Every structure is written in C-alpha cells, then in structure tokens.
C-alpha cells in the first residue's frame, strides 16, 4: 500500500497522505515499523502523545484544498517505518480504511 | 501500561466463524473504548469497528453484517466474532485501546463538530489465515 | 394649515461615488445644508398625529418606486424556469441543493449543461423523483438584482418645497398623538435610514427618557404596538460560509449569477444577542406596558405565517436573513439564533414580482442596533 | 357552422414541457392554412395580438 | 474574398415551423465558430442587435 521517500539520515522527510481537505480536518498519523504492531505518532494534526519526539510535526487542519502532511526533522535510522494517515473530515463519511501511506527509507 | 494479549485459532477454513480474543491486563475492559483493526498483508490497516461500555458500539459498514464485538466484564476480555470467513479476511488482527477527542469547527449549539478517534495501545496482534 | 404635499430627497452624505450605485442615491437630489436652521416657536401648541400622518405614505411610496427603478433594467431569470435536476450537497457526516440545468447559450440552437447551488427555501419539488423547480415559476416572473447596485441604507432627509414648512415635536415624553408644547420649525427632517426589518426595529433612533410605547388604539389587539427603546441592544449577525460566485451566460449579454461552490465547512447563519441586555430590556418593556394594562405581561414567539412574519427578516450586506426569534420572545451567555437564508425575494408583499438576490463572495459580518420592537396582542 | 373546436400545444410554466389544451373559436377569428385540419389565428401572419 | 453566402434556420409566423433562408454578409460582420464552415453574427456573443 505505501509509496516511498528516500531520506539520508539527518535530512528531513516529506510524507503526504490522503485527499484534499474539504472542511476542517483532523489527521491521525501512525508509525509502522516492519514486524511491529503500529503505534500513534500524532493526533489532531499536531498533538503528540508522550514519548514522541518533536521532530515529528505536520500540517494544520485549518486549510482547505491541501493534503495531510507529516514532516520529519532530521530523520534517524530508527524512523524507518511505514507512515499512515487516518483522515477525519467534516464534509466526508467516516473513513474506516486508513489512507495509503509512505515508507520512509533511511539511506544510512 | 496495559498489555493486550491477543489469541485466536491461527488457521481457519472458509465459511467458518472466526473468534479472536484479547486478555486485557493492567486496566479494566470497561475503562476505555475498544477497537479492532486488521492489516492484510500488502495493505494498509482497516478499522473493523469499535465496542464500548455504555452501549457505544459501531461498525465498519462493509463488515458489519458478519461481525460482532463484545466486552466480557467478568473475564476482562475484549473479543471479536466474524462469521462467513473468506480468503479476503486473511490479515493480522489487532486489539487496541481507543482514545478520542472532539473537534469544533463551528457553533457548538448547532452541532458543528465531530468526534475523532485514534488508537493509543496496540497489542501484538494475531495472524489469521483462511485456507 | 395642515397639508399634504410632495417632499424631496436631500442627502448630507455625498461621501460615496457614483460607481457604487447605491439605490437611494438618486443622484438627482441636493445636498443638505450642513448647518440647518432649527427655529423654536414659542407659545405654540401643535397637534401631531403619527397614525394619520402622510409623510409615512409618501416615504413608503418613494421607496417602492426607487427599488423598482433600479431593478427594472437588469437581466430577467425567467429562462431558468426549467425542470431542475437536483441532488443534495455533501452536508454529510440539509438545506443546500446541487442542481443542474439545461440552458440556452448565445447561439439559439445550442444548449449547455450547467450547475448551481440553491438554498432549499428557493426550490420546490415537482415530483417525488429528482425533479424540482424554482419557487416563483408557477406564479410569476423573476428579475435578477443588479450586481452593481448597493442596498446599504443612506440617511435620507425629507425636505419641503417653498411655501411649505415642516414642524417637529420636541417633547421627550410625547406619544403618537396630541398637542406638543415645544414645537420647532425646521428647514427639513434629519436623515432617516430606510432600514428594512420586521419583528425588530434596527438602526433607528432612541427614546430619550424612557421606553415609549405608541399605539393607534391600545385596546385594539389588531394594531401594531410600536415600542421605542431608550437604550440600544447590539445584534451581531453572520454568514459563516465562504461563498463563491459562478457567472453563467444565459443569453446575448445576459448574465446570471449563481451560487458557486462552498469552501470550507458548511455552517449555519446566525445572530448573537447578549442574554443579559435582552432580559433587562424586556423587563423594562413589560414594566412600561403594565402602566396601560395593570395585568401580568408575558411575551410569546411569533405564531405563524410565512418567514416574512414568523422570523426576523432583514437585509445585511446585500444578503437576506430570516432569523428565528423564539429564544428572545419567551444565565449570562449569548443567545444564538439560527438563521435561514434565501435568494428569492418578494418585497412588500407584492406577490408576483420576484427578485433574485445574487450571491456575495466571501463571508458576511454585520453589526446592528436594535432600537425598537413591533408587537401585537392576542384574562388577568 | 361557425364555431370551431381547436387543440393546441402549449408551453407550461416550465419551459421544457408542453400540454395539449382545447379552446373554441368563432370562424371569423380562424383561417385555414391547409386543406387539411391545419389552421391559424388570423393575426399571426401580420402582427402581434 | 469578403462576401459570404450564409443559410439560416428561422422561425416563421407559426412557432412550430422553421424555414431555411439565405442572406449575404460582409466578412467583417461574420465570425467563425468552428474550423468547419460554421459561423455566427459578430455581436451575438456580446449583446442584442
Ligand atoms: C456567537 O456566539 C457563539 C458562541 O456562543 C460564537 O461561537 C463560536 O464560534 C467560533 C468559530 O468562529 C468557535 O471558535 C472555534 O472554537 C474551537 C474550540 O475552541 C475551544 O476549545 C479549545 C480546545 O479546548 C482544550 O481544552 C479542553 C478542556 O477540557 C479540552 O477538553 C480540549 O481537548 C482541549 O485541550 C480551546 O483551546 C479554545 O480556547 C482558545 O481559543 C479561544 C477562542 O476564543 C480563546 O478565547 C481562548 O483564550 C483560547 O485561546 C476554546 O475553549 C477552536 O478550536 C477553533 O479554532 C481552531 O479551528 C478553526 C477552524 O477554522 C481554525 O481556523 C483555527 O485556526 C483553529 O485551528 C487550530 O487549532 C486546532 C485545535 O485542535 C488544531 O486542530 C488546528 O490544526 C489548528 O492548530 C494550529 O495551532 C496549533 C498549536 O500547536 C499548531 O500546532 C497547528 O499547526 C496550527 O497552527 C475556533 O476557535 C467558538 O468555539 C464558538 N463558541 C463556542 C462557545 O462554541 C459565534 O461565533 C458568535 N457569532 C457571532 C456572529 O459573533
Ligand atoms: C455520522 O457518523 C457519525 C459516526 O457514527 C455519527 O455520529 C456519532 O455516531 C456514534 C455512533 O453512531 C454516536 O454514538 C451514539 O452514542 C449514544 C450514547 O451517547 C454517546 O454520544 C454522546 C454524544 O454527545 C456522547 O456525549 C456520549 O459520550 C459521553 O460519555 C462517554 C462515556 O465515557 C466515560 O466512560 C469511559 C469508560 O469507562 C471512559 O473511557 C471515558 O473517558 C469516560 O469516563 C465519554 O466517553 C464521552 O467522551 C462523553 O463524555 C456518548 O459518546 C449511544 O446510545 C448510541 O448507540 C446506538 O444507537 C445509534 C443510533 O444511531 C447507533 O448508530 C449505534 O450503532 C448504536 O446502535 C445499536 O444498534 C446497533 C444495530 O446494529 C448495534 O449494532 C449497536 O451495537 C447498538 O446495539 C451511539 O453509540 C454518536 O452519538 C454520534 N455523534 C453525535 C454527535 O451524535 C453521526 O450521527 C452520523 N451523522 C448522521 C447525520 O447520521
Ligand atoms: C446598521 O448600522 C451599521 C453600522 O453602520 C451597519 O453596519 C455596517 O454595514 C456595512 C455594510 O454591510 C459594512 O460595510 C462593509 O464592511 C465590509 C468589511 O469591512 C472590513 O473592511 C473595511 C475596509 O474598508 C476600506 O475599504 C473599503 C472598500 O470600499 C472602503 O470603502 C473603506 O472606506 C476603506 O477604505 C474596514 O473599513 C472595516 O473596518 C472592516 O475591516 C467591507 O468589505 C464592505 O466593502 C465591500 O462591500 C461594499 C458594499 O457597498 C462595497 O461598497 C465595497 O467597495 C466592497 O465591495 C468590493 O469589494 C468586495 C471584496 O470581495 C467585492 O466582492 C465587491 O464586488 C466589491 O469589489 C463594506 O465596507 C460595515 O462594516 C458595517 N459596520 C460594522 C460595524 O459592521 C449595518 O449594516 C446597519 N444595519 C442594517 C440592518 O441596516
Ligand atoms: C425556531 O426554532 C424552534 C425550535 O428551536 C421551532 O420550534 C419547533 O417548531 C416545530 C414545528 O414543527 C415543532 O414541531 C412540532 O411539535 C409538536 C409538539 O407537540 C408536534 O406535535 C408536531 O408534530 C411537531 O413535531 C417543535 O416541537 C418546536 N420546538 C420546540 C422546542 O417547541 C420554531 O418553530 C422556529 N421558529 C421559526 C420562526 O423558525
Ligand atoms: C449602537 O448604539 C451605540 C450607542 O449610541 C453606538 O455607539 C456610539 O457610536 C458613535 C458613532 O459615531 C460614537 O460616536 C463617535 O465616537 C468616536 C470614538 O472615537 C468619537 O471620537 C466621536 O467624537 C464620536 O463620539 C459614540 O461615541 C458611540 N457611543 C459609545 C457609548 O461608544 C453604536 O455605534 C451603535 N451601533 C450601530 C450598529 O449603529
Ligand atoms: C424645546 O425644544 C428645543 C429644540 O427645538 C430645545 O432647544 C435646544 O436645547 C438644547 C439643550 O442643550 C440646545 O443644545 C439646542 O441648541 C437647542 N436648540 C435650539 C433650536 O435652540 C429646548 O431646550 C426644548 N425645551 C424644552 C422645555 O424641552
Ligand atoms: C440528473 O438526472 C439523472 C437521471 O435522469 C440522475 O441520475 C443519474 O443518471 C445517470 C444515467 O446514466 C447515471 O449514470 C448516474 O450515475 C445517475 N446518478 C446517480 C447519482 O445515480 C442524476 O443524479 C441527476 N442529477 C443531476 C444533478 O444531474
Ligand atoms: C436536459 O436534462 C436532461 C436530464 O435532466 C438530459 O437528459 C439526459 O441526457 C443524457 C445525455 O447523454 C442522456 O444520456 C440521459 O439518458 C438523458 N436522461 C434521460 C432520462 O433520458 C437532456 O439531454 C438535457 N438536455 C440538454 C440539451 O442537455
Ligand atoms: C403555484 O403557486 C401556488 C401558490 O400561489 C402553490 O400553492 C401552495 O404552495 C405552497 C408551497 O409550499 C404549498 O405548501 C401549498 O400547500 C400550496 N397550496 C395548496 C392548496 O396546496 C401551488 O402549489 C403552486 N403550484 C405548484 C405546482 O407547486
Ligand atoms: C398619550 O396617551 C395618553 C393616553 O394614555 C393621552 O391622554 C388622553 O387620555 C384621554 C382619556 O379620556 C383621552 O380622551 C385623550 O384623547 C388622550 N389624549 C390624546 C391626545 O388622545 C395623552 O394625551 C397622549 N399624549 C399626548 C401628547 O397628549
Ligand atoms: C458584537 O461584535 C462586537 C465587536 O467585536 C463585540 O464587541 C467586543 O466585545 C468584547 C467583549 O468584552 C470587547 O472586549 C471588545 O473590545 C468589543 N469590541 C469592540 C470593537 O467594541 C460585541 O460584544 C459583540 N456582541 C455580541 C452579542 O457578541
Ligand atoms: C403538437 O400537435 C401535434 C398534432 O397536431 C401532436 O402530434 C401527434 O402527437 C400524438 C402523441 O402521441 C401522436 O400519437 C400523433 O401521431 C402525432 N401526430 C402526428 C401527425 O404524428 C404533437 O405531439 C403535439 N406536441 C405536443 C408537445 O403535444
Ligand atoms: C397574411 O395577411 C395578408 C393580409 O395582410 C393575407 O392576404 C389576404 O388575406 C385574406 C383573408 O381572407 C384573403 O381573403 C385574401 O385573398 C388575401 N390576399 C390575397 C392576395 O390572396 C395573406 O393571405 C395572409 N397570409 C396567409 C398565409 O394567409
Ligand atoms: C438547421 O440547419 C441544419 C444544417 O446546419 C439542418 O441540418 C441538415 O438538414 C438536412 C435536411 O434534410 C439533412 O439532410 C442534413 O443531413 C442535416 N445536416 C446534418 C449535419 O445532419 C437542419 O435540418 C436545419 N433545421 C431546419 C428546421 O431547417
Ligand atoms: C433609559 O436610559 C437611561 C440611561 O441611563 C436609564 O437610566 C433608564 O433607566 C432607562 N429607562 C428605561 C425605561 O429603560
Ligand atoms: C421557552 O419556551 C419553552 C416552551 O416549553 C419553555 O419551556 C421555556 O421555559 C421557555 N423559555 C423561557 C426563557 O421562557
């Protein structure tokens, strides 16, 4: 399902996911390291749970016509993972299926 | 820290009922919302549905007719029952704790808002293969 | 002697240009005297009567006339009286419909398929299927408001022709009729803004000492009771949606302005009235009304009829709002009144002369002053 | 004699549809077009009414 | 050169019928619509004539 982004360690990542916003949006981002159960990176566009470094941040839900974006600052080898978004949107049906993600390849 | 230890038959035949479990340890089954997620190999995860105490239960419309989720308040278990199992249902299944919040975009009095959800704690998951 | 004559337009405000085309700027009327002369007539007792006045009929008549004169030359929308094919917009997880049309293009042998959005209040189903029509088509013609005409009220001064004079009553407690012991003569009236409203009176003048209740016949329940407040209440109204406009050709230089796509969230229009000011005001209105009835006074919501009577119908920014007032005429928060919006207007009960209000792009923010109320009556 | 029973195809309030209606006319107001039952109102080939 | 020979389908005094007619026009008053021989009168796309 995921597409690919090639990032040298220390370089940033640009991960996009889903369709354009129609109205206010709330994006949930998940991290899937291969072989692991997945876990939460970000909820509500930019709120991260404890344990997530602040190198992970993303797009606001206030814009329209834009897509969800996750930016990873200074990508590390431990960040190799499949990143997925789950999109909630005020003008769309609930999405019961995760969006198509991106594999972050650390070129180390 | 809660541990969600899942279990199931592993290998099932087509048209059999699949019954998965989840032994919740460290929290009570009635403490949070539960949800099930599955991830077919080569696919992005699919949200099956969520079950909750106080009657707050909902399902993925494409699966709903074959699936029932439940909470066992005595044994502190979270479970999933899927009937009519087919090859397309082979996937890694997960038990997870669901947390939520609300987003307001307009006037609260006119209900210009929605609930959003995310999964906070995931178990190891189980592998289900349909012959 | 008392007389009925023709008064003329005058305007103190010459601030605006001739490009904005305000409907009340006739551009045929004179500037007012910036320093008008008010002369007190001592020892006179003039009998005034607001119910039998003729200035009201004249102002009303001239407003109707100017309105029609500016509307008359613009594009007719009768070519749109076709079966509409409509489905709902994605007001999903209400009142806006997405309709398609088959319209005539500049060359008569060709038709084009176009889309527009409509408010439910402007569209009526024909069939149980997706077959709808614009509401005016089975009654009469509809004209598009001119896209360049402004309907923002300008205070208009009414001045007498030579040989005539205007007298005014300066008695602070004066009701609709009676001798006024303090009467002055003026070159002309102050400017009165032609504000259009129904249940509430907006942007008018205030009483100076107390709430003054004026009625032609206070014991006749069928009469309108006009209540003038001695304190204003701010009302904040908005149209929160970001609207867009689609310009559609419907003929040889004949342009129609359709509601375009909705950007962002779909939200309901509304008005904000502070609860505390509202209650304080109504406590005083009942207190003053009690001086005429010596009975318990209660207020109730409007009882029935079309939106023009059942809701607070007003124009703001060129948009037409129909706001619910049930939470007013019935804590420390703000009362939020939901409002409906509609584009097909039949001004002054002149059924059969419909007007289409084109969409305004962007969002609308209004601030207005409630200066009075219009009440009717239906025991101790 | 002199009263004719005529049918028409008339556009309704919605421009895409037509209805069949009937009206009676005095002979003096209706002139044949064809030798068949095809007639017109007398003013139509001259002017507006 | 500059004079075109054009045909039209026009409404006759009875609304249900159309007639094919011809007229000549100067090139300056005729605008191509298509790459084919399909033209319009020069101002029908802006106003009444
Ligand atoms: C008539 O009167 C009525 C009311 O009677 C008026 O109605 C009002 O209408 C307005 C709309 O114009 C509504 O405004 C929105 O309100 C929501 C909700 O705000 C409330 O809740 C917030 C969250 O609560 C927190 O605490 C609670 C505690 O329990 C907790 O449960 C909850 O989970 C959370 O932890 C509060 O923060 C907020 O307070 C803040 O804002 C107040 C605004 O006035 C301010 O006064 C306070 O001092 C304080 O600053 C309040 O309690 C807002 O969320 C919303 O703003 C977001 O959404 C709009 C949508 O377009 C967007 O444009 C904004 O930019 C903003 O989006 C940012 O924040 C989102 C939060 O989730 C985030 O998801 C977005 O991605 C985005 O994030 C940005 O910042 C982060 C920061 O880290 C950054 O990382 C991102 O990259 C990005 O830069 C609006 O403010 C009013 O709520 C509503 N009133 C009521 C009572 O409902 C009506 O308008 C009046 N009409 C007229 C004509 O006057
Ligand atoms: C667009 O889609 C959305 C999504 O479906 C629809 O919006 C939402 O949909 C939900 C499910 O459809 C609706 O949930 C119904 O909730 C009812 C109970 O009230 C809840 O909702 C209100 C809304 O205000 C909440 O305020 C309230 O939550 C409060 O309390 C919570 C309690 O938690 C405490 O305890 C726990 C545990 O210890 C702690 O973890 C917590 O922290 C806390 O301490 C708290 O969690 C909340 O934060 C908050 O404080 C509740 O959330 C239920 O009674 C309904 O149940 C049944 O009826 C509905 C009717 O539609 C069915 O849809 C639903 O499936 C249920 O149906 C029954 O029958 C079917 C048959 O198949 C069975 O399959 C079901 O199993 C069941 O037997 C719902 O659960 C939610 O309310 C709704 N949102 C809103 C704002 O209304 C949306 O409506 C739809 N749009 C349109 C136009 O339809
Ligand atoms: C009761 O009384 C109250 C109090 O007077 C009335 O409330 C007023 O109502 C006015 C009309 O609804 C409203 O005026 C509009 O305000 C909008 C937003 O205001 C902000 O921006 C202006 C910018 O001002 C500068 O630019 C304008 C542009 O012409 C100049 O005219 C000014 O002199 C300034 O140079 C600020 O001044 C404000 O403080 C706010 O920040 C304006 O956008 C809107 O302008 C557009 O509409 C006009 C309609 O006539 C038009 O003349 C003007 O040119 C603009 O239209 C052009 O631009 C738009 C942009 O998209 C385009 O789409 C158009 O096609 C066109 O190109 C008005 O200025 C007052 O703000 C409001 N007062 C308050 C306090 O809210 C109340 O209505 C009345 N109630 C009743 C029921 O009668
Ligand atoms: C302003 O908003 C209020 C509600 O916020 C509107 O009041 C509601 O009006 C509807 C009219 O259909 C009432 O529904 C009817 O209720 C009776 C109750 O017995 C029922 O028998 C009928 O079959 C129907 O359901 C509704 O109850 C009423 N709500 C309340 C709280 O009274 C009001 O009409 C709106 N006014 C305007 C001018 O828009
Ligand atoms: C609703 O009624 C209130 C109260 O009358 C209005 O407030 C008043 O608005 C006028 C506008 O001219 C203010 O006058 C001017 O204010 C400026 C402020 O700098 C001053 O410099 C001028 O000399 C002049 O005084 C007036 O002061 C203000 N009153 C108060 C108490 O603030 C309000 O504007 C009205 N709202 C509407 C929509 O009409
Ligand atoms: C009678 O009415 C006149 C107005 O016609 C009042 O005179 C004004 O009084 C105010 C008081 O501040 C002055 O500022 C104005 O300049 C006066 N106007 C004129 C035209 O002189 C007069 O005060 C009123 N008298 C009573 C008893 O009410
Ligand atoms: C317009 O009318 C058509 C039917 O008359 C509506 O239904 C569509 O019909 C076509 C026929 O080929 C189908 O291909 C479409 O899939 C149908 N649409 C849907 C949603 O089923 C159509 O919805 C009407 N609406 C508009 C706005 O044009
Ligand atoms: C007028 O609108 C109608 C639909 O409301 C159009 O009818 C459809 O036209 C498409 C064109 O291919 C056909 O495929 C559909 O089958 C037609 N619908 C039905 C029910 O037959 C009609 O063509 C429009 N007219 C114009 C000039 O666009
Ligand atoms: C033609 O217009 C008349 C009004 O002059 C319509 O009559 C009423 O329309 C309202 C609109 O909601 C209905 O609620 C009423 O029930 C109608 N009256 C009756 C007695 O039913 C008339 O329906 C319109 N014609 C069509 C075909 O809609
Ligand atoms: C304001 O209203 C009061 C009545 O509430 C007027 O008082 C008079 O009351 C008597 C009672 O019999 C009537 O016959 C008079 O005709 C009333 N006067 C008038 C003018 O109708 C009071 O006079 C009114 N205001 C003024 C300015 O006089
Ligand atoms: C209507 O809008 C006005 C303008 O924003 C509001 O006035 C503000 O009210 C707050 C409340 O404390 C003050 O702090 C601001 O300074 C005021 N602004 C101005 C320009 O005076 C008004 O309160 C709103 N009314 C309602 C009912 O919400
Ligand atoms: C216009 O009038 C003509 C007749 O003058 C109608 O033509 C007949 O229509 C019926 C309808 O089923 C057919 O069965 C007949 O065979 C038609 N006549 C011929 C000679 O073919 C025509 O349909 C009318 N148009 C409308 C819209 O009613
Ligand atoms: C169009 O109108 C003209 C009159 O301006 C018609 O000419 C005469 O019509 C009368 C009507 O009975 C006939 O009796 C005359 O014989 C007609 N004149 C001639 C020279 O025949 C003309 O016929 C009308 N056109 C059509 C098609 O009827
Ligand atoms: C309108 O003009 C068009 C040509 O531009 C006419 O179409 C032709 O009509 C003849 C009549 O037999 C056919 O043989 C041709 O095959 C048609 N052309 C095409 C491309 O099909 C049309 O008939 C005219 N309409 C009227 C009422 O005269
Ligand atoms: C009129 O306004 C003044 C302003 O101070 C206020 O004191 C008085 O009580 C008000 N009277 C009424 C009846 O509202
Ligand atoms: C509004 O009307 C309802 C009708 O049931 C009533 O119950 C409510 O108390 C009223 N609110 C106020 C402020 O009077």
Author numbering:
A (entry chain L): 6 to 9, 11 to 67, 67A, 67B, 67C, 68 to 95, 95A, 95B, ...
B (entry chain H): 1 to 82, 82A, 82B, 82C, 83 to 100, 100A, 100B, 100C, ...
C (entry chain A): 46 to 138, 152 to 189, 191 to 309, 312 to 321, 321A, 322 to 354, 356 to 359, 361 to 392, ...
D (entry chain C), E (entry chain E): 152 to 189, 191 to 201
Manuscript text:
To chemically stabilize ConM and ConS Env trimers whilst avoiding the known pitfalls of aldehyde cross-linking, we used the zero-length hetero-bifunctional carbodiamide cross-linker 1-Ethyl-3-[3-dimethylaminopropyl]carbodiimide hydrochloride (EDC). EDC activates carboxyl groups on acidic amino acid (aspartic acid, glutamic acid) side chains that react to form a covalent amide bond with proximal amines on basic amino acid (lysine, arginine) side chains, without the addition of any atoms to the molecule. As anticipated from the SDS-PAGE outcome, differential scanning calorimetry (DSC) analysis revealed that cross-linking enhanced thermal stability by 18.7 °C and 17.6 °C for ConS and ConM respectively. However, comparison of the unmodified and cross-linked structures revealed a striking near identity, with a Cα RMSD of only 0.45 Å between ConS and ConS-EDC, and 0.5 Å between ConM and ConM-EDC. Strikingly, close inspection of the ConS-EDC and ConM-EDC density maps, and careful comparison with their unmodified counterparts, revealed a series of high-confidence cross-links. Note that the ribbon structure at left is rotated ~90° counterclockwise (as viewed from the top) from a. c K340-E290 intra-subunit cross-link in ConM-EDC gp120. Surprisingly, however, the structural conservation is somewhat dissociated from antigenic conservation, with many bnAbs binding less well to the cross-linked trimers, particularly in the case of ConM. Particularly affected were the fusion peptide-specific bnAbs ACS202 and VRC34, which lost ≥80% binding. Interestingly, the dramatic loss of VRC34 binding upon EDC modification of ConM was reflected primarily in a highly reduced on-rate (>600-fold slower), suggesting that bnAb access to its epitope was limited by trimer cross-linking rather than direct EDC alteration of the epitope, which would be anticipated to impact off-rate. Therefore, it seems most likely that fusion peptide exposure is prevented by locking the trimer into a ‘closed’ form.
The HIV-1 envelope glycoprotein (Env) trimer is metastable and shifts between different conformational states, complicating its use as a vaccine antigen. ConM is based upon the sequence of all group M isolates and stabilized by an SOS disulphide bond, whereas ConS is a SOSIP—UFO combined design of a group M consensus soluble trimer. To interrogate the effect of EDC cross-linking we carried out cryo-EM analysis of trimers bound to PGT12232 Fab fragments, and solved the structures of unmodified and cross-linked GMP versions of ConS at 3.1 Å and 3.45 Å resolution respectively, and unmodified and cross-linked GMP ConM at 3.4 Å and 3.85 Å respectively.
